[PDB]
Write a protein that binds this ligand. Structure first.
Ligand SMILES: *[C@@H]1O[C@H](CO)[C@@H](O[C@@H]2O[C@H](CO)[C@@H](O)[C@H](O)[C@H]2NC(C)=O)[C@H](O)[C@H]1NC(C)=O
Ligand SMILES: *[C@@H]1O[C@H](CO)[C@@H](O)[C@H](O)[C@H]1NC(C)=O
Ligand SMILES: *[C@@H]1O[C@H](CO)[C@@H](O)[C@H](O)[C@H]1NC(C)=O
Ligand SMILES: *[C@@H]1O[C@H](CO)[C@@H](O)[C@H](O)[C@H]1NC(C)=O
Lengths: 49, 50, 224, 100, 22
């Protein structure tokens, strides 16, 4: 369910952000998405452990 | 050791039927035209701008 | 007079399909057991947000929207004549008590099938410069539950502040108006994808408990 | 001709280059702005006639409806998954076995 | 399957693969 989370970005689709915004802002939006999803994955790994 | 996924082959783009055209086919191809002092500006919206 | 909307006023918030999964959405909605006004006429109503319209029947006709009802801002003029729907977005010289015969004594073209003991349920949302219409007709405010599906969307992008109602007079009357409020529900779909039952999320502690566990059956115990 | 901005959302523009159809193949698509990659398969669901696509419990696009016809096409992801190597020690031999 | 085992067995209901048990 965390894949459909905006995480403070414009949208939650990788193809939507890259083909609509300029790369200087796309870099920041994608970086925010990656750090949010990585935090979610780390939380799930700790819970599983 | 790695991840195995199959690559996509070709791309398809889908969109609805191209209908509800503008009167561009008659504003360029009309019977007559208005003069330069009393020209007829026509509203263009809600049609396919092909 | 006044009456209470028992459980009606629920519509599909999006154009997605779900199969027997309990889902929660937050859009401009009509609260359950609210205070819906039973307006009667043989008027000027404010439009703070979307409104819930319902009537029974053929003298009831179309609707008039707008900000001021003047000759300076565009006003929606939706009318029916038992065979077609007409939408006009312009400025007109509106009068205090408008009606139809067909002489036009009341003062972006879309023509489609007309909407018209049966009960009809209409809601008129306005968000992000759009204008969405939802319609449903049911036979037998009488109790019961049903869905409410969109049929047409109108991209206009104007501010709407006022709401009216048109009538037809023969020469030779009772409609309910509710107000939408921002809150969430929890919707249960089924196999065929239509809405079967809905529950409010902030109406009652049991309803809020149903909202926070995403189920209709609450087992015995204490929940936060 | 003179163009105008900032009055309404866009409501007039030309063709969008509709393409053909493929079935039973891992291809990428763009259906009414809904991007995704999967295998296009004939469906047996029954959509209501106002809904563009559909989701599931996992909140993923699994059923989509093409705007040309009234039929609906299921979306399932194509073949993916990790690969593992079965081998004895290199002091023993160099024979290997591949698992998918 | 023993009847006790059958009674026990009948009372229990992207990028995320599930490895089967050994
Ligand atoms: C877009 O145009 C196509 C082409 O005509 C339409 O496809 C037709 O669909 C009907 C529906 O049963 C078939 O009987 C016809 O045989 C189809 N045409 C062809 C050439 O095969 C399609 O319905 C149109 N879509 C919209 C939304 O208008
Ligand atoms: C609805 O509002 C009217 C107006 O004050 C009030 O008399 C009535 O009691 C209200 N309805 C309920 C159920 O309280
Ligand atoms: C209803 O209104 C439409 C649009 O004004 C018109 O074309 C149609 O003829 C009308 N029908 C009748 C029965 O007057
Ligand atoms: C779904 O539609 C089928 C079609 O006949 C019908 O048999 C079934 O009762 C419907 N189910 C619901 C929940 O509406």
């Amino acid at each position: 369910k965390q894949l459909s989370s905006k995480f403070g970005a414009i949208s939650s689709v990788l193809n939507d952000i890259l083909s609509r915004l300029d790369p200087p802002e796309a870099e920041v939006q994608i970086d925010r998405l990656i750090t949010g999803r990585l935090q979610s994955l780390q939380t799930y790994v700790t819970q599983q452990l | 050791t790695s991840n195995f996924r199959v690559q996509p082959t070709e791309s398809i783009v889908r969109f609805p039927n191209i209908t509800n055209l503008c009167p561009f086919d008659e504003v360029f191809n009309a019977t007559r035209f208005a003069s330069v002092y009393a020209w007829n500006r026509k509203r263009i919206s809600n049609c396919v701008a092909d | 007079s006044y009456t209470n909307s028992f459980t009606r006023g629920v519509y599909y918030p999006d154009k997605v399909f779900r199969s027997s999964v309990l889902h929660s959405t937050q859009d401009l909605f009509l609260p359950f057991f609210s205070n819906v006004t039973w307006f009667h006429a043989i008027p000027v109503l404010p439009f703070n947000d979307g409104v819930y319209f319902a009537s029974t029947e053929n003298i009831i006709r179309g609707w008039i929207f707008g900000t001021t009802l003047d000759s300076k801002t565009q006003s929606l003029l939706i009318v029916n004549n038992a065979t077609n729907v007409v939408i006009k977005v312009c400025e007109f010289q509106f009068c205090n008590d408008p009606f139809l015969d067909s002489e036009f004594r009341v003062y972006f073209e879309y023509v489609s099938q007309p909407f018209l003991k049966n009960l009809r349920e209409f809601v008129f949302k306005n968000i992000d410069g759009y204008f969405k219409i939802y319609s449903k007709h049911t036979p037998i405010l009488p109790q019961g539950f049903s869905a409410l599906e969109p049929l047409v969307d109108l991209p206009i992008g104007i501010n709407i502040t006022r709401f009216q109602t048109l009538l037809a007079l023969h020469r030779s009357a009772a409609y309910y108006v509710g107000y939408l409020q921002p809150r969430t529900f929890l919707l249960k779909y089924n196999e065929n994808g239509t809405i079967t039952d809905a529950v409010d999320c902030a109406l009652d502690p049991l309803s809020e408990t149903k909202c926070t566990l995403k189920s209709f059956t609450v087992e015995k115990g204490i929940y936060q | 001709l003179s163009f105008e901005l900032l009055h309404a959302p866009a409501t007039v523009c030309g063709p969008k280059k509709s393409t053909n159809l493929v079935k039973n193949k891992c291809v990428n698509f763009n259906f009414n702005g809904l991007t995704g990659t999967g295998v296009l398969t004939e469906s047996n669901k029954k959509f209501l006639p106002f809904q563009q696509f559909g989701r599931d419990i996992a909140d993923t696009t699994d059923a989509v409806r093409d705007p040309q016809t009234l039929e609906i096409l299921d979306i399932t992801p194509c073949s993916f998954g990790g690969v593992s190597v079965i081998t004895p020690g290199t002091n023993t031999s160099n024979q290997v076995a591949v698992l998918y | 399957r023993s009847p006790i085992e059958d009674l026990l067995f009948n009372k229990v209901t992207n990028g995320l693969t599930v490895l089967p048990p050994l």
